[PDB]
DNA sequence: TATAT
DNA sequence: ATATA
DNA sequence: TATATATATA
DNA sequence: TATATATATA
């Protein structure tokens, strides 16, 4: 029914879907202009925990608070509840948009 | 005796925004998104007409844009400044999301 | 889809729903004639890795190989995990019936 | 008065 | 040449 | 080092 | 439902 966002701004606080991984906490990077301009409709994104970036579309993208429920459940897979701590206690971490 | 510029202000309100550098500018004040980062204290999100900048901004850079207008609304020719005039009298919901 | 048993046969393996628990694995064990009745459609209910037993109808009941992926997943209440080993290494344990 | 636009 | 610092 | 588990994809 | 990957335990 409520769909997910298309467009995401520096700072949104995500879970974000890689193949082969589960929906990880994950923040939305700010693009420098000056910069190399990346694949419309793909944004820069911080996996918190592994502190792992890549670039990913809206459809790969959670937002945080409405998804928290359902992918914010420990999982055993390397710097994942490292994960969860960040985005509650340390979303700020190494953001460089604000 | 001097009316005071607000402290507080609040998603859609539209400014004149003082940066370093430039004259003060059109501009709105942004919502900032539930679940995202929390800005700096006191801080709010701009964005600039005319050229759709972003910064963040204090409220003793940030003026009240009817109660300034007739200060700051001159034309200039920094780029994007006139078709910022433009935008905050003829569009000045582009790209808010706040509602 | 499929309705689950309406009866069942000493010996048969299942998960047994009781509340406050997690469905967990279990055994239908014999009536003995010669004893004093059950209401009608309970069962005698042997409960693997606790031991306990109870008395319940099919509405509580799950055919352990249907149901064992659903419901065979580790749980950490006290008994649980030891009741999955027994009722795939042991399921005969203090079984009368036959 | 010097500098950036 | 403007208009910024 | 090599087991089993848990969870990812197909 | 079956397989492959990543992680904990022996």
Redesign the interface.
């Given at each position: 029914a409520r769909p997910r966002p298309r467009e995401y701004?520096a700072?949104?606080?995500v879970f974000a879907k890689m193949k082969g991984y589960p929906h990880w906490p994950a923040?939305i990077d700010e693009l420098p202009e000056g910069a190399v301009k990346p694949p419309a409709n793909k944004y820069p994104i911080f996996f918190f925990g592994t502190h792992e970036t890549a670039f990913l579309g809206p459809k790969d993208l959670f937002?945080?608070?409405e998804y928290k429920d359902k992918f914010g459940k420990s999982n055993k897979r390397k710097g994942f509840n490292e994960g969860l701590w960040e985005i509650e206690n340390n979303?700020?971490v190494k953001?460089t948009?604000?």
């Open positions: 701004k700072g949104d606080l923040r937002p945080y608070k979303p700020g953001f948009g604000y």
